[PDB]
Amino acid sequence: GFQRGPDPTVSFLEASSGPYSVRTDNVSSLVGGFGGGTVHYPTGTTGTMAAVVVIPGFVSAESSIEWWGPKLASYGFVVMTIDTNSGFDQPPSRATQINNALDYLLEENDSSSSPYSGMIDPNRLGVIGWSMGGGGTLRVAAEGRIQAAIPLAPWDTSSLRFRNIETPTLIFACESDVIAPVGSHADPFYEAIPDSTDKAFFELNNGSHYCGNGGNSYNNELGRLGVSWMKLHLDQDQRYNQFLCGPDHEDEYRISEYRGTCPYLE
Ligand SMILES: [Ca+2]
Ligand SMILES: [Ca+2]
């Protein structure tokens, strides 16, 4: 089907990058209506691949989610990281931002002249979203548009909107998060999602609010689990199930808590 790349291994997933060289396309904030960002897309590939929007969502961010761009794109995804300081803020605006970003990728995908023209399978959209962008991600997951959601230290005001999420959703919770404390955000958000949904809750041990952003102490977990999430759900690549369903995740030092609804794709 949509499988791409070799049979995965942990080292393959935890390597600083995936196999593909990644080219980038800078998106000015003046186009797309999502604050600008960077499209990351692999070279050397053929066929279409899933597209992932990676959105920040912490206005006073000292750093952002850009690690996800090259990291995820290098495994065979078109991955657009959205810039910070976009004028977007609260989770509802972040959902709008995500939708605008997804529109933009699809629009560029549909262009004959985009450097990644035709590279995106519009049916296979993922969103990784941090903080209020994680709330936005959960909101877009609830809107039914996307095929995989990875809220990173999500912040939102209510879990009720998430009670019917059917989108495969991996929430990276950050154990020590004081911005979006897990007990008030990532945890109840995760628990709001039906147990019928393919979902995972990975609380990263001692994680600050930034713990899911990558380029940090959690690269292994974020890469191994997050890339697997996208592979499994966006590519229907069952070869990545082994990293998500099977392992005793909490045995990992870096994973303070795991919840999930394995098996997936039943
Ligand atoms: Ca701890
Ligand atoms: Ca299940």
Numbering used by the authors: 28 to 293
What wording appears in the published article?
In this study, we recombinantly expressed, purified and characterized Ple628 and Ple629 as marine PET hydrolases. As predicted from the sequence homology to the lipase and cutinase families, Ple628 and Ple629 both belong to the α/β hydrolase superfamily, and the central twisted β-sheet is formed by nine mixed β-strands (β1–β9) and surrounded by eight α-helices. The catalytic triad S174/S179-D220/D225-H252/H257 was conserved among all PETase-like proteins (positions in Ple628/Ple629, respectively). Like previously described for IsPETase and PE-H, Ple628 and Ple629 form two disulfide bridges, DS1(C217-C254/C222-C259) and DS2(C288-C305/C297-C314) (positions in Ple628/Ple629, respectively).
Ple628 has a shorter extended loop, similar to the IsPETase and PE-H. We observed that Ple628 had a higher affinity for the substrate pNPA compared to Ple629. Ple628 required 1.8 mM of the substrate to saturate half of the Ple628 present in the reaction, while Ple629 required 2.1 mM. We observed that, in general, Ple628 has a lower activity with all the insoluble polyesters tested than Ple629. Ple628 could also degrade 3-PET but to a lesser extent than Ple629. Similar to Ple629, Ple628 had poor activity on 3-PBT. We did not detect T production at any time point, which indicates that MHET was not further hydrolyzed to T and ethylene glycol. Even after 144 h of incubation, Ple628 produced less than 50 µM of BT with either of the tested polymers. After 72 h, Ple628 released only 52.9 ± 1.1 µM of MHET, compared to 785.9 ± 27.8 µM of MHET released by Ple629. The Ple629 protein was only detected when the biofilm proteome was examined separately, and not in the whole community proteome. These findings led to the hypothesis that Ple628 played a bigger role in ecovio®FT degradation than Ple629.
